RNA sequence: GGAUAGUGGCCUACCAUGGUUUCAACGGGUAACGGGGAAUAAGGGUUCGAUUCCGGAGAGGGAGCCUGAGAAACGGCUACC
RNA sequence: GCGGUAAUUCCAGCUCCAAUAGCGUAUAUUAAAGUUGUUGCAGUUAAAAAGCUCGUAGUUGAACUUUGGGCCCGGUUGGCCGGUCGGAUUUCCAACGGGGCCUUUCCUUCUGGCUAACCUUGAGCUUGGCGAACCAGGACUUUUACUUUGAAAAAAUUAGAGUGUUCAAAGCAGGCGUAUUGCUCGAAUAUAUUAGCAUGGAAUAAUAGAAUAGGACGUUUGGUUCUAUUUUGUUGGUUUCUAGGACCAUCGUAAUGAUUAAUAGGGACGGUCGGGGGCAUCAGUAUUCAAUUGUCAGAGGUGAAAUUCUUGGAUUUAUUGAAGACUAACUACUGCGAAAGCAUUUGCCAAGGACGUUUUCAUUAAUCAAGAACGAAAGUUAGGGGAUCGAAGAUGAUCAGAUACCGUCGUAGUCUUAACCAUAAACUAUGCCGACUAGGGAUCGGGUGGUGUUUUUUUAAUGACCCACUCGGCACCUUACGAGAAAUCAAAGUCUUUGGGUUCUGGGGGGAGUAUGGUCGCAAGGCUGAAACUUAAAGGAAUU
RNA sequence: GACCCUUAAC
């Protein structure tokens, strides 16, 4: 069955990005998905995305620029201490000067550098680069 | 999902699965069964001393043709009868019979060193004197 | 999908987007309520009530026109079945298969199907005891299922 | 087809696809006002009725259940919605 | 209730089958004293830890005890093997 | 691998190389080993997907509830560059990290000896009042996991600061003078395993609240035990309007109060569809007959024969015939079933997928140790049937055979059981569920749209065809983006740019699927399952 | 129709 809607959303984005398509339909649009996209959008990896309000669960159409190389989900959402952020960024990000580990902390969904300056931590959601 | 469970609460399954599958490793199985302690003739030690019982003419395994010089040795601590190679040229005349020898493995961790069938050990000392010393004339075996 | 089959069919109602509907319904909500009640008093299940409401009357669905779903209406005014209609039909099916099996002992297909039906009964009854729709210690018993169908 | 307006599909494309595959799923069925000849007795009938509907006046069955849309009886007239 | 410095089935006078268990009880093995640690490392790990420190146990094997604040002490005693 | 009479491999001499007061060897162990794989393995064919389904534990599990907008602020400000040292000043610009206040927003409100932010006010600022930068007096901060923060790893060790042990390992020492007095810095500092506290953290993820109200609000009106201090003659008990944790006792107030209906799942209904299943019936060849008639004498069988049958008539010809099995041709890159499997007609009996649905329930789900149903053929008890073919069992060719392959026979062997057995190259050698990623036609079901073409009594219910869709299914055209060792792959892709959920299995070849064992079975055997020992390969896919 | 086998000897 459906286990992680973020995983299917990020898979749809990855498969759309790999085939050159500038847009992708996402079902069924959880709030975690939107927060993951806004972090993506804030750094410019996607562009504009529109939520579609079917009265059931929501649909997303994301406009895609060519910048995103890979977005992913880390399953399960591992617990990440402040000291464990370095291991996660060095394990999955392509370099040190770009790319973001996206984690959910009690201060909200954010990328790893924002959690470093806000000095927060939590569980890892995924990554974008 | 790659087979193995991934859930954050599946540590026990991953632990037990690893435990079961380490038994397919030869070294882990041999170590935790204690085969060297219970079956190997040195009892798990690097060296062993014994008494020469007979000179041997072990033929070479194919494709090489040679007579490897070996000695039947009954180990002192066990009484187990093993075959030890006398390595260098003419060193059989130093290890003739009934003497006390020091034995070591061949470096194969219990297999055959070369074309010598069934021989696991080699001679390193004769009557307290290193076989390399007798072969290089540096020392001589006690005549009386 | 299809718990007990390899079928992957996706066929279902497409509920309309509009919540407050249909704007051609000239009847009242209270007129739909009593119409539901007079159907239920005649021994009709909520599924049969909704089909007749949607068929011979202009009832999109009770939830849209009235405030509540049909099973909610029946429960509110005391016409709720003692066991849920979906579990009831599953037990009725198991009873009819079991009656068939006692006349055809070589029907191994029906023996395999009976296992599937009672697996569904036990999984559905467990859900109903969890949400306390069925009392705890309620059990599906094959021997007494036929007489205690109603 | 790399670039597509997935927010504003054409009505032809939306109508072509399955009712659950449109941007927002909607029922393709409809309700219709059916009357027998003579007495008006307007009865609202579901298109996919699946039960033989007769008017409230008497036994004047108006449609026959079918695997899809209900077929209307021989002598009758219907208006959409 | 007795015993103990004291709690306590620690032991003595009753019902109930009470307690544990696939989240592995209970058995078996350990070339098992535990730990601080050691060796080896990209990151995770694997192996070891009799042994300079800490805790435990023992004085050939068991058992029992005197004195003493403190020992079931062994360069204290008593007995058997 | 070298040595089998010019061996760069042995024994030596010369020469040379590596490390060097150290250098070999043996045995373990660590890395190498992404060959144990959480990171991070492999399972179509190299080892490996259980035959198939159900199913408990375990693991995992759709979406939704304050996602926004204004105001001001003691706070490293990088620079609008030498007002806080070859040297830098918050006001014409930083992400301001954070704080408080409004925006329906609420971080529990009341005892008083303190009277705090408030138009209750003596000079460009308090001589009466509303509360957290202040305070003891409430059973009540839903339950947690996951924060940041650290009251803590005993020392030693490790990392590491300083230091003129000559350097260094080390050690925790030391350093400097009025030549002669004395003074002074040290011996810091650091979660390589996990459970208590944290006026600031609710993002992530669950069996929490109010559904036949038993709900909330309390200073509405009552009334129902109370070890009751403060005040009234024996110590103490017996008594009121009192301040306090009481029943929903009620002519109160409250938009009074169970989110969506997941291209999740279950259930219902409708017209269908299918060689899905079971029980009865009903039809189509051989084998053996019967009474015909035919006869030379052949028939049968083979590579060629022979075994064999033929007056007693074989074989062959042609209507009432005793049986048993099988269901041809139609029959397909077709259908159904969980697989095994399922193909004459009709009746009966329950079942099922797909479709359609503006029906209903509402997360009931996915996968699953243990556990359970079914499970070809062969085989095994037992009664019935036994036509056909035919493991076993005798002629001929081979001859060195042929106790094989070929002929003719022929016992056991495919129906009903308490029935058992439980295995197959049970194969797609591809576990299941879910999502996404290219093309193009066809087909099976089911729907939708075309007054499309053709059809009783000919153009008065329909059916069968044709186009266009659509859902589900069986499949189908490439060394194709991608994957792969390749073969090849519509998944075997989305996999070093490595994580959707989950079950099972493998870790060089052999010994060996071989038990000292256990368990199931009537047995045959099934399931579980080593070690010694021995090997340098065994193996996969290509190429020539 | 029948058709088995093949160095220890660099």
Swiss-Prot record, chain A:
<dbReference type="GO" id="GO:0002181">
    <property type="term" value="P:cytoplasmic translation"/>
</dbReference>
<dbReference type="GO" id="GO:0022627">
    <property type="term" value="C:cytosolic small ribosomal subunit"/>
</dbReference>
<dbReference type="Pfam" id="PF00410">
    <property type="entry name" value="Ribosomal_S8"/>
</dbReference>
<keyword id="KW-0687">Ribonucleoprotein</keyword>
<dbReference type="InterPro" id="IPR047863">
    <property type="entry name" value="Ribosomal_uS8_CS"/>
</dbReference>
<keyword id="KW-0689">Ribosomal protein</keyword>
<dbReference type="GO" id="GO:0005829">
    <property type="term" value="C:cytosol"/>
</dbReference>
<comment type="subunit">
    <text>Component of the small ribosomal subunit (SSU). Mature yeast ribosomes consist of a small (40S) and a large (60S) subunit. The 40S small subunit contains 1 molecule of ribosomal RNA (18S rRNA) and 33 different proteins (encoded by 57 genes). The large 60S subunit contains 3 rRNA molecules (25S, 5.8S and 5S rRNA) and 46 different proteins (encoded by 81 genes).</text>
</comment>
<dbReference type="GO" id="GO:0003735">
    <property type="term" value="F:structural constituent of ribosome"/>
</dbReference>
<keyword id="KW-0963">Cytoplasm</keyword>
<dbReference type="InterPro" id="IPR035987">
    <property type="entry name" value="Ribosomal_uS8_sf"/>
</dbReference>
<comment type="similarity">
    <text>Belongs to the universal ribosomal protein uS8 family.</text>
</comment>
Swiss-Prot record, chain B:
<keyword id="KW-0832">Ubl conjugation</keyword>
<dbReference type="InterPro" id="IPR005680">
    <property type="entry name" value="Ribosomal_uS12_euk/arc"/>
</dbReference>
<keyword id="KW-1017">Isopeptide bond</keyword>
<keyword id="KW-0689">Ribosomal protein</keyword>
<comment type="function">
    <text>Component of the ribosome, a large ribonucleoprotein complex responsible for the synthesis of proteins in the cell. The small ribosomal subunit (SSU) binds messenger RNAs (mRNAs) and translates the encoded message by selecting cognate aminoacyl-transfer RNA (tRNA) molecules. The large subunit (LSU) contains the ribosomal catalytic site termed the peptidyl transferase center (PTC), which catalyzes the formation of peptide bonds, thereby polymerizing the amino acids delivered by tRNAs into a polypeptide chain.</text>
</comment>
<dbReference type="Pfam" id="PF00164">
    <property type="entry name" value="Ribosom_S12_S23"/>
</dbReference>
<keyword id="KW-0379">Hydroxylation</keyword>
<dbReference type="GO" id="GO:0005829">
    <property type="term" value="C:cytosol"/>
</dbReference>
<protein>
    <recommendedName>
        <fullName>Small ribosomal subunit protein uS12A</fullName>
    </recommendedName>
</protein>
<dbReference type="GO" id="GO:0003735">
    <property type="term" value="F:structural constituent of ribosome"/>
</dbReference>
<dbReference type="GO" id="GO:0006450">
    <property type="term" value="P:regulation of translational fidelity"/>
</dbReference>
<dbReference type="InterPro" id="IPR012340">
    <property type="entry name" value="NA-bd_OB-fold"/>
</dbReference>
Swiss-Prot record, chain C:
<dbReference type="GO" id="GO:0005829">
    <property type="term" value="C:cytosol"/>
</dbReference>
<dbReference type="GO" id="GO:0070181">
    <property type="term" value="F:small ribosomal subunit rRNA binding"/>
</dbReference>
<dbReference type="GO" id="GO:0000462">
    <property type="term" value="P:maturation of SSU-rRNA from tricistronic rRNA transcript (SSU-rRNA, 5.8S rRNA, LSU-rRNA)"/>
</dbReference>
<keyword id="KW-1017">Isopeptide bond</keyword>
<keyword id="KW-0832">Ubl conjugation</keyword>
<feature type="cross-link" description="Glycyl lysine isopeptide (Lys-Gly) (interchain with G-Cter in ubiquitin)">
    <location>
        <position position="42"/>
    </location>
</feature>
<dbReference type="Pfam" id="PF00312">
    <property type="entry name" value="Ribosomal_S15"/>
</dbReference>
<dbReference type="Pfam" id="PF08069">
    <property type="entry name" value="Ribosomal_S13_N"/>
</dbReference>
<feature type="modified residue" description="Phosphoserine">
    <location>
        <position position="31"/>
    </location>
</feature>
<comment type="subunit">
    <text>Component of the small ribosomal subunit (SSU). Mature yeast ribosomes consist of a small (40S) and a large (60S) subunit. The 40S small subunit contains 1 molecule of ribosomal RNA (18S rRNA) and 33 different proteins (encoded by 57 genes). The large 60S subunit contains 3 rRNA molecules (25S, 5.8S and 5S rRNA) and 46 different proteins (encoded by 81 genes).</text>
</comment>
<dbReference type="GO" id="GO:0030686">
    <property type="term" value="C:90S preribosome"/>
</dbReference>
<dbReference type="GO" id="GO:0003735">
    <property type="term" value="F:structural constituent of ribosome"/>
</dbReference>
From Swiss-Prot, chain D:
<keyword id="KW-0963">Cytoplasm</keyword>
<protein>
    <recommendedName>
        <fullName>Small ribosomal subunit protein eS27A</fullName>
    </recommendedName>
</protein>
<dbReference type="GO" id="GO:0000028">
    <property type="term" value="P:ribosomal small subunit assembly"/>
</dbReference>
<dbReference type="Pfam" id="PF01667">
    <property type="entry name" value="Ribosomal_S27e"/>
</dbReference>
<keyword id="KW-0687">Ribonucleoprotein</keyword>
<keyword id="KW-0863">Zinc-finger</keyword>
<dbReference type="GO" id="GO:0005829">
    <property type="term" value="C:cytosol"/>
</dbReference>
<dbReference type="GO" id="GO:0003723">
    <property type="term" value="F:RNA binding"/>
</dbReference>
<dbReference type="GO" id="GO:0008270">
    <property type="term" value="F:zinc ion binding"/>
</dbReference>
<keyword id="KW-0689">Ribosomal protein</keyword>
<comment type="similarity">
    <text>Belongs to the eukaryotic ribosomal protein eS27 family.</text>
</comment>
<comment type="subunit">
    <text>Component of the small ribosomal subunit (SSU). Mature yeast ribosomes consist of a small (40S) and a large (60S) subunit. The 40S small subunit contains 1 molecule of ribosomal RNA (18S rRNA) and 33 different proteins (encoded by 57 genes). The large 60S subunit contains 3 rRNA molecules (25S, 5.8S and 5S rRNA) and 46 different proteins (encoded by 81 genes).</text>
</comment>
